[PDB]
């Protein structure tokens, strides 16, 4: 588990997968591990920064309606950045 940083090996199972083929019936075992993806990374690199990005687009609701250049600059930069992040 220490050499597996990105996931968490939650469960394992030991089963049989014997099958009937055209050349005959072959005996077969199957072990299965269950990998849960670590969330801390996606919290910090995806969710947090997107909220921080959406929240910025709101601070333009507090600029006077006369200074539209400021509003567009915010709304557009946050939208563009949003794209990049997703890419």
């Amino acid at each position: 588990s220490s050499s597996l940083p990105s996931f968490q090996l939650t469960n394992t199972s030991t089963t049989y997968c014997t099958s009937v083929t055209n050349t005959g019936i072959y005996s077969c075992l199957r072990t299965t591990i269950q990998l849960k993806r670590e969330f801390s990374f996606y919290l910090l690199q995806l969710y947090i920064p997107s909220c921080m990005l959406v929240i910025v687009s709101w601070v333009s609701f507090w600029f006077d309606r006369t200074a539209i250049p400021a509003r567009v600059t915010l709304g557009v930069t946050t939208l563009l950045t949003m794209t990049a992040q997703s890419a």
Binding site: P5, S6, Q8, E38, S40, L44, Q45, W62
Partner: protein, 79 residues
């Protein structure tokens, strides 16, 4: 850039604390702009000179606070 060369982990790295903090200092800068600009256009001169006062304080408070941060940060992770 930095985060792309790293594997996703389950803990918070000291690199995260540092990017996150600087991120805030810039976020609060924007916030200040809105606060200043908003109470600025308000008709009464009561808010107007307050608007001016917020800048004067920011011009010093931000640097001081950021310097304070560095001190805490480096003593915590440079050890």
């Amino acid at each position: 850039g930095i985060n792309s060369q790293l594997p996703p982990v389950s803990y918070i790295k000291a690199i995260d604390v540092w990017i996150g903090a600087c991120m805030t200092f810039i976020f609060c800068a924007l916030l200040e702009f809105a606060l200043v600009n908003h109470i600025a256009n308000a008709g009464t001169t009561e808010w107007n000179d307050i608007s001016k006062r917020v800048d004067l304080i920011s011009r010093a408070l931000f640097p001081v606070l950021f310097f304070v941060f560095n001190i805490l940060y480096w003593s915590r992770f440079g050890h």
